[PDB]
UniProtKB/Swiss-Prot annotation, chain A:
Name assigned to this protein: Vesicle-fusing ATPase
UniProt subunit comment: Homohexamer. Interacts with GABARAP and GABARAPL2. Interacts with GRIA2. Interacts with PLK2, leading to disrupt the interaction with GRIA2. Interacts with MUSK; may regulate MUSK endocytosis and activity. Interacts with CDK16.
Physiological role: Required for vesicle-mediated transport. Catalyzes the fusion of transport vesicles within the Golgi cisternae. Is also required for transport from the endoplasmic reticulum to the Golgi stack. Seems to function as a fusion protein required for the delivery of cargo proteins to all compartments of the Golgi stack independent of vesicle origin. Interaction with AMPAR subunit GRIA2 leads to influence GRIA2 membrane cycling.
Location in the cell: Cytoplasm
Whole-protein coverage range: 330 to 412 of 744
Similarity-based family: Belongs to the AAA ATPase family.
Curated annotation (Swiss-Prot), chain B:
The encoding gene: Snap25
Reported function: t-SNARE involved in the molecular regulation of neurotransmitter release. May play an important role in the synaptic function of specific neuronal systems. Associates with proteins involved in vesicle docking and membrane fusion. Regulates plasma membrane recycling through its interaction with CENPF. Modulates the gating characteristics of the delayed rectifier voltage-dependent potassium channel KCNB1 in pancreatic beta cells.
Residues of the full protein shown: 6 to 83 of 206
Domain (t-SNARE coiled-coil homology): residue spans on this chain: 14-76
Region (Disordered): 1-18
Protein name: Synaptosomal-associated protein 25
Source organism: Rattus norvegicus
Domain of life of the native organism: Eukaryota
PTM comment text: Palmitoylated.
Protein family per UniProt: Belongs to the SNAP-25 family.
Residue stretches spanning the membrane: none
Region listing for Interaction with CENPF, in residue ranges: 1-70
Subcellular location: Cytoplasm, Perinuclear region; Cell membrane; Synapse, Synaptosome; Photoreceptor inner segment
Quaternary state and interactors: Part of the SNARE core complex containing SNAP25, VAMP2 and STX1A;this complex constitutes the basic catalytic machinery of the complex neurotransmitter release apparatus. Recruited to the SNARE complex following binding of the SNARE complex component STX1A to STXBP1. This complex binds CPLX1. Found in a complex containing SYT1, SV2B and syntaxin-1. Found in a ternary complex with STX1A and VAMP8. Interacts with HSC70 and with SYT9, forming a complex with DNAJC5. The interaction with SYT9 is inhibited in presence of calcium. Isoform 1 and isoform 2 interact with BLOC1S6. Interacts with CENPF.
């Protein structure tokens, strides 16, 4: 998702295509028309590069961090891959 | 040393169309219909010309017959 969504501005180009995309996405997810039968899942390696606006109440607003497993997780993974 | 430089990116404006697919199809359909009508008119005109050519011979024959009959009757009368 970070490839498409980056902080408004902060880009050196005349076309300005990296801002209209973000604005259209923001309008569609949360606009005047109320659409409530959709769920969007976005995964990334660098949460910082994501535009701050998308991370707030109403828009996204639930964020999970997947960390390195523990001894039990390592045992389970090894069992799964050696079964 | 706050001397910055830039590079440029380009975008292509949409080519000339997206109005050549609604009036276009109607134009083509009308052209086809006009072509069919013209073919029919061709056929009818040829038939009419043939019929006029046919009429000509009977016209000439009746003219000749009447003239000859009138001359003969006048000759016998006197």
């Amino acid at each position: 998702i970070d490839a498409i969504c980056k902080q408004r501005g902060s880009m050196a180009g005349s076309t300005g295509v990296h801002d209209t995309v973000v604005n259209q996405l923001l309008s569609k997810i949360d606009g005047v028309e109320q659409l409530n039968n959709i769920l969007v899942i976005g995964m990334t390696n660098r949460p910082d590069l994501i535009d701050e606006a998308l991370l707030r109440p109403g828009r996204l607003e639930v964020k999970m961090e997947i960390g390195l497993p523990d001894e039990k997780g390592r045992l389970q993974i090894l069992h799964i891959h050696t079964a | 040393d706050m001397r910055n430089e830039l590079e440029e990116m380009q975008r292509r404006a949409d080519q000339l169309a997206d109005e050549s697919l609604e009036s276009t199809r109607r134009m083509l359909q009308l052209v086809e219909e006009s072509k069919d009508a013209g073919i029919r008119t061709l056929v009818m005109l040829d038939e009419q010309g043939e019929q006029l050519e046919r009429i000509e011979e009977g016209m000439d024959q009746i003219n000749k017959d009447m003239k000859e009959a009138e001359k003969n009757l006048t000759d016998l009368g006197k």
